[PDB]
Structures are given as structure tokens and as C-alpha cells.
Amino acid sequence: HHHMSEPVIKSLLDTDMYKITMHAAVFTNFPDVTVTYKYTNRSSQLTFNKEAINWLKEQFSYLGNLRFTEEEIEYLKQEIPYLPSAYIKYISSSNYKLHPEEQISFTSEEIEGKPTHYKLKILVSGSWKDTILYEIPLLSLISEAYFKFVDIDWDYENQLEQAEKKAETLFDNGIRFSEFGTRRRRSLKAQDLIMQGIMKAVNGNPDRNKSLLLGTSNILFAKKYGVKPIGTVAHEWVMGVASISEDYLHANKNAMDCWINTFGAKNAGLALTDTFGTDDFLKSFRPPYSDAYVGVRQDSGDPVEYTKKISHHYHDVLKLPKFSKIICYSDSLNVEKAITYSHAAKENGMLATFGIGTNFTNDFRKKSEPQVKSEPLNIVIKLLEVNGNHAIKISDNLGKNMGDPATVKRVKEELGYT
Ligand SMILES: [Cl-]
Structure with a gap:
């Protein structure tokens, strides 16, 4: 039974x-x-x-x-x-x-x-x-x-220690990061063990490290471990706004308006720019919008090229001082990439933060072959x-799109990419 x-x-x-x-x-x-x-x-x-x-x-x-x-x-x-x-x-x-x-x-x-x-x-x-x-x-x-x-x-051997080592490297490089691995965790227990490792790292030098750990996207673990829960707008917001009536031409602005009118300008957070390509987003990214959002989230394309583009926008087009705004890098990060991108941000007058997901919660070797990766799903x-309307994403990896091809083609035309 x-x-x-x-x-x-x-x-x-x-x-x-x-x-x-x-x-x-x-x-x-x-x-x-x-x-x-x-x-x-x-x-x-x-x-x-x-x-x-x-x-x-x-x-x-x-x-x-x-x-x-x-x-x-x-x-x-x-x-x-x-x-x-x-x-x-x-x-x-x-x-x-x-x-x-x-x-x-x-x-x-x-x-x-x-x-x-x-x-x-x-x-x-x-x-x-x-x-x-x-x-x-x-x-x-x-x-x-x-x-x-x-x-x-x-198996779970060394999961806590591995997370701790990652966190310690990040903190030594002054990296401000959050844990973001809920969706692809190997298990609830895996994520809990990596939370343990991160906090063990924090508590080795809390005076320095507490302010570098932004928190976790997972609200339950934020509550459990006494850290901040961290979130941004997601792609599905502007995708839904556009698809409701297929006004893609005004979707980025309409989505920001709605977000701001809901939570308040001061709580706008980080803007996600790449849904219909960062260029389309930038056409409407000027005051008050560019003042309300505290920065941008980088989620596709080449992060260094993105950083340059955004820096030019903020400092040259919008005439903001260097280090006024944040880029949050969140696309398939590991410690070495976070460090590299932190350098590029500094070079280009941007504050940098990081969301580190699957690398935290689904980084396992095979038990049978300890030098071989156990691949995540x-x-x-x-x-x-x-x-009833198709929902699509263009992204900044321009020929790597998501959704109904005909719709993606039509939208690229309407937004002037094609
Ligand atoms: Cl399947």
C-alpha cells in the first residue's frame, strides 16, 4: 500500500x-x-x-x-x-x-x-x-x-564547504551578491546546505562580509537565515504587458509605468532591459524612469558589451555622475565571472551586484567519478x-529569441531592429 x-x-x-x-x-x-x-x-x-x-x-x-x-x-x-x-x-x-x-x-x-x-x-x-x-x-x-x-x-559531501569557499572568494574581492538558485536546486536540502556555507563565510568576518551578502531570492531562506529577500522585475512582466494588446511599440514604457504606479517610484528596483532588446528599452529610459530605478539587471548577451552600452547611456546621454547606478549581473554566473564583470563595471563607472543561481545550488560531481560533473536538468x-496572443522574448542575444517565430519577426520590424 x-x-x-x-x-x-x-x-x-x-x-x-x-x-x-x-x-x-x-x-x-x-x-x-x-x-x-x-x-x-x-x-x-x-x-x-x-x-x-x-x-x-x-x-x-x-x-x-x-x-x-x-x-x-x-x-x-x-x-x-x-x-x-x-x-x-x-x-x-x-x-x-x-x-x-x-x-x-x-x-x-x-x-x-x-x-x-x-x-x-x-x-x-x-x-x-x-x-x-x-x-x-x-x-x-x-x-x-x-x-x-x-x-x-x-551525494551531499562537501556541499557546505564548497559554498563557503565560493562565498569567501567573493567577499575577498568585495563582491556584493545574492543567492538566486531556487529554481534549479538539486534539492531543498542542497539549497539549505549552501545557505549554511554562505552564512559560515559571512560569520568568519561579519564586520566586512555582512554588507557584501545582499541576501537570497528565496524568501523562506531569507527568513530562516536572517538575511534580506532580494528581487527584481522578471521578463514575464513586460512580455505580458505587450501581449495583452500586442502594443510592443509602447510595452517597455507601459510596463515601467505600471510597475511604478503599483509599488512607488522609490521601490522600482532594477530595470530589466533586454526583453525586447536593450536598445528599445533605452529609448524611454530617461527621467523620471531613469531616476526611479536604481539600476539595470543584465540577463543576456555579452556582459562587458552590455556594461559599456549602459555606462554610455547613464553618463553620456543622461549626464549622471559615475557610480550613480547599479548593474546586476545574473546570467549563469560563477565566482570567476562575477570577479571579471566586477572589474568591467568599475572600469566603466558602474556599481556592480550579482545574482548567483545554479552554480550555488546545483554544483555536484558524480559519486562514481568524483572528477566528472553531475549535469543539472x-x-x-x-x-x-x-x-490567446503569443508571448515572446527577443533578448540581447539577437538571433536567440523565444516564442512564436512569426510574432518575433513582426516585433523586430515594429521595434526597428529589422
Ligand atoms: Cl522531460
């Missing part, structure tokens, strides 16, 4: 802070809009078994049992005080919950020519306010499933459709 598994996702705060701020933004501005997200496994030679699938089915259902506790809501009000009152009331209500049975469509398919091996098919669809939170916990669960049931050639859950 089957015994029910212990739920892995024990809190609606076991997620990235950007999910909650998006949730507040979507609730506030677009409570009616409907969306679909889609899972994609970019590592398609990595496959699933029946055991993993059955555990996933169970774990997904448990998401429907979660509620924000009193202490959790208090934590949100304290650390994210600019969340609107009405949003807090909405998530505080006894009416609030996730409905995975209605929102998640999870099937699996035996792979042609690979019997006993399966690919996952996952669509998450419904009102945007009902669907926005699933991305992170679903990814966190799928990764955990894969390393629990499919690839077990690995390269999975995403991406916004696909909004009110």
Missing part, C-alpha cells in the same frame, strides 16, 4: 521574491487576464521514470494545501512594505489558495525508441493571478524528482500565451 510522501514545498515563501512582487503587480493591474505557461526540458536526453512521475503528481497536488501563515504575512509586510494593502488582504484571506487540479495539466509520454523512459508535458493555465506562483516550486520539484529517482549518482517554465 502506498504511503504519502512528505511535502517538499512547505511554504508559499519557498520561492523567488520576484514571484511575489509579480503576483502583487498582476493582482493589482491585470486580475482578469488569462495566461498559459509551458514546461520545456532543454536537456532532452535527460528523461524520467514512472517513480519520478508518480511522486511529482503527488507533490504538485500538495501545492493546493498551502496557505500563507500569519507569521509569513507578517514577514512580507516587514521586508516588502511596499506591497499594496489590497494584495496583502487578498493573500491573507481564507479564500486564497492554489488550485493545481484546475491550473496544472501534467501528462507524460513514453519516448519513442526509449521504452520505460518518459518526457513530461506540463501546461499551467488560468488567470494570471492564479498561475504566476507555480513556476518556481514546479521547477524546484521537477529537479528534486530527477535527482531523487532518476540520477542518484551524487536544464528546465524552464515560460510564459507562452496571454489572452
